[PDB]
Design a protein around this ligand. Structure first.
Ligand SMILES: *[C@@H]1O[C@H](CO)[C@@H](O[C@@H]2O[C@H](CO)[C@@H](O[C@@H]3O[C@H](CO[C@H]4O[C@H](CO)[C@@H](O)[C@H](O)[C@@H]4O)[C@@H](O)[C@H](O[C@H]4O[C@H](CO)[C@@H](O)[C@H](O)[C@@H]4O)[C@@H]3O)[C@H](O)[C@H]2NC(C)=O)[C@H](O)[C@H]1NC(C)=O
Ligand SMILES: *[C@@H]1O[C@H](CO)[C@@H](O[C@@H]2O[C@H](CO)[C@@H](O)[C@H](O)[C@H]2NC(C)=O)[C@H](O)[C@H]1NC(C)=O
Ligand SMILES: *[C@@H]1O[C@H](CO)[C@@H](O)[C@H](O)[C@H]1NC(C)=O
Ligand SMILES: O=C(O)[C@]1(F)O[C@@H](F)[C@H](O)[C@@H](O)[C@@H]1O
Length: 595
């Protein structure tokens, strides 16, 4: 008996916040060409779909009394050019200088270092920007990854106070949290629990005052292959913190490593296709619906990060916990690198289409109501029109997911019933669908017989499977209603997008870049901040050799790989946005390219 999904577009309930716009990784590199492509792909997720890159060992990018910030500057500018912000973990030894945090003299040094950089990057990027940064403590303090740096319980507190006072020295507007650990039951997690006690009741190493600033409490809780397990563990900790530390009852909680399974480098077949992609969405849906949608004890949950910014190494291009699939093509002159947009990343773009208000939804099956703690669930959103550039929007994202388990055999009958669409000009809807049959680059790689050094055409055919199967913008049935009966696969994601026609056309594409891949092959990447609407069909790309359309299948991802059969790539490019009503926006300023 089918699953019934009901959406009431009239019933805009609470606000909906895009709390999942973060990724992260650990270096083993950060300035190499591999990473520059990687972060271009990450920053290319439409509508600021990913915003933060939580980066380990950032203070190893600083050398040594004075400091050389050259390497750190490089990475931060790379983040900056890709419209990203660091998850600035204050983690490193400044090239082996810092060794002991019970060393009174080193505690003062650290304070001065943190102040140094914060001010530097305030100078570099503007306090407005740097205040948005989540400055954080050393990653997982209770997991002992300090290298030669000695960090005792007391040491960790001096460390923190210096982090906090140092940041304040730069500006009071700067945000710092921690510890970024798991928070197991005591006697376990001594430093995580010790930190809170210290902030709640301790004395500031520098000022001697009681209580120390803590703008957020960050934890890591992973699923062990179960999606609800993440939400369940978080509840336990968040409640323990409310009751043990009453001052922190309103302190925002981040889970900045909220992954299905610990061990990114561990190959897993589900980490390759839409199994991972649908599950990531399921985790988020569960968090929205069963934690943040006005329950009874609504814990302050502000951030969920999928720690999947890693680069995959051979012989596991798709199977590892990464947003992109890396190919080190070692047999061309010279050896070059290529990246493939995995389903999980494409899925981040579908989440990105959700807007600031959550609509009322209900998933039932032949009578019985089902919370997102089941294989099929939904997130639905509505948008209040801002300027003349946008109109009313509805984003309905349905997922089908058995977590870490795929079932190609099975088929999931679903009947969506949308009601109560506010009346307005030119109401059309668009469907976007992802599954393992139609939308898996790993799948197509495997049909091609797993080429270890793929050719041009092999890459073209693998990229064919990146974007979700889209349907032409059909007009919405009379009386603000719509009924669909899709057959969903397991796993699968489906996003029905209902938009009304705004007054003005879309805005101008900006910040266009050409990034070389190999002979006769490049990446075109851009930015949508000024586009000013989410109702887009595709980006028209035009090429000149002293302008004609580059013919490609529809895609609203802010990255395109140009691999023409002629090999002719040298010239000039420009890009513009094309909405659901065939309306062209202004072209981006032309970008030149010489090979
Ligand atoms: C094209 O050319 C590139 C180089 O230009 C080659 O890329 C190298 O690929 C190999 C694997 O194919 C990489 O080596 C592997 O690194 C993994 C992670 O490395 C880091 O992490 C570990 C653990 O945290 C550290 O110990 C280590 O020092 C690194 O910091 C390891 O997990 C791998 O080891 C595992 O497999 C081997 C068997 O191969 C076992 O012996 C081990 O026990 C372990 O299980 C492995 O060492 C390497 O990093 C890549 N180099 C670069 C510079 O990118 C490609 O190989 C080549 N392509 C082809 C098809 O040949
Ligand atoms: C999500 O659903 C599962 C059931 O599928 C719940 O797990 C059950 O929890 C109860 C406690 O109320 C136990 O008695 C059962 O043994 C569990 N059943 C199974 C099949 O594991 C789980 O608690 C639900 N969690 C949330 C947060 O809704
Ligand atoms: C910092 O280091 C880089 C190389 O890593 C070097 O080229 C540069 O001269 C150094 N800068 C200063 C100011 O010493
Ligand atoms: O799951 C992991 O591989 C991981 F090692 O877990 C944690 F130990 C780390 O802090 C993360 O960098 C990383 O996601």
């Amino acid at each position: 008996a089918p699953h019934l999904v009901q959406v009431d577009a009239a019933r805009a309930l609470w606000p909906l916040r895009r709390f999942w716009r973060s990724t992260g990784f650990c270096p083993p590199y950060v300035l190499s060409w591999d990473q520059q492509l990687n972060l271009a792909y990450v920053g290319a997720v439409p509508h600021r779909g990913i915003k933060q890159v939580r980066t380990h060992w950032l203070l190893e990018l600083v050398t040594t009394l004075s400091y050389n910030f050259t390497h750190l500057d490089g990475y931060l500018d790379l983040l900056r050019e890709n419209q990203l912000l660091p998850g600035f973990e204050l983690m490193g030894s400044a090239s082996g200088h810092f060794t002991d945090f019970e060393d009174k003299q080193q505690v003062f040094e650290w304070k001065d270092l943190v102040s140094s950089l914060a001010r530097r990057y305030i100078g570099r990027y503007g306090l407005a920007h740097v205040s948005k940064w989540n400055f954080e403590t050393w990653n997982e303090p209770d997991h002992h990854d300090f290298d030669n740096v000695s960090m005792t319980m007391q040491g960790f507190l001096n460390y923190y106070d210096a982090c906090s006072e140092g940041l304040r020295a730069a500006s009071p507007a700067l945000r710092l949290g921690g510890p970024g650990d798991s928070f197991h039951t005591p006697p376990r997690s001594p430093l995580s629990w010790g930190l809170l006690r210290h902030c709640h009741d301790g004395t500031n190493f520098f000022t001697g005052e009681a209580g120390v600033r803590l703008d957020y409490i960050s934890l890591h809780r992973k699923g062990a292959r179960s999606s609800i397990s993440i939400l369940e563990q978080e509840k336990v900790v968040a409640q323990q913190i409310r009751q043990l530390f009453p001052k922190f009852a309103d302190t925002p909680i981040y889970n900045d490593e909220a992954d299905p399974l610990v061990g990114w480098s561990l190959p897993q077949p589900w980490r390759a296709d839409v199994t991972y992609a649908a599950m990531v969405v399921k985790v988020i849906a569960q968090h929205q619906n069963l934690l943040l949608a006005n329950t009874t004890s609504a814990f302050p949950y502000a951030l969920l990060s999928n720690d999947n910014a890693f680069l995959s190494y051979h012989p596991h291009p798709f199977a590892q916990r990464t947003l992109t699939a890396r190919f080190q093509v070692n047999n061309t002159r010279p050896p070059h690198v290529q990246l493939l947009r995995k389903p999980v990343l494409t899925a981040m773009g579908l989440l990105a289409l959700l807007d600031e208000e959550q609509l009322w939804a209900e998933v039932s099956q032949a009578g019985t109501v089902l919370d997102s703690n089941h294989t099929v669930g939904v997130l639905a959103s509505a948008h209040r029109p801002q300027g003349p550039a946008d109109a009313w929007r509805a984003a309905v994202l349905i997922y089908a997911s058995d977590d870490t388990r795929a079932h190609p055999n099975r088929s999931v009958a679903v009947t969506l019933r949308l009601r109560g669409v506010p009346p307005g000009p030119g109401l059309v809807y668009v469907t976007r669908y992802l599954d393992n049959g139609l939308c898996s680059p790993d799948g197509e790689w495997r049909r091609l017989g797993r080429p270890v050094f793929p050719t041009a055409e092999q890459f073209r055919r693998m990229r064919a499977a990146e974007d979700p199967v889209a349907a032409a913008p059909r007009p919405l049935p009379a009386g603000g209603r719509l009924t669909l009966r899709p057959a969903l696969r397991l796993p699968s994601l489906l996003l029905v997008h209902v938009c009304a026609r705004p007054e003005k056309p879309p805005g101008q594409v900006t910040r266009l870049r050409a990034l070389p891949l190999t002979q006769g092959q490049l990446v075109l990447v851009w930015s949508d901040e000024h586009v000013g609407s989410k109702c887009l069909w595709t980006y028209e790309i035009q090429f000149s050799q002293d302008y004609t359309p580059v013919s490609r299948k529809p895609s609203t991802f802010n990255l395109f790989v140009f691999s023409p059969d002629t090999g002719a790539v040298s010239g000039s490019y420009r890009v513009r946005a094309l909405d659901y009503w065939a309306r062209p926006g202004p072209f981006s300023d032309p970008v030149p390219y010489l090979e």
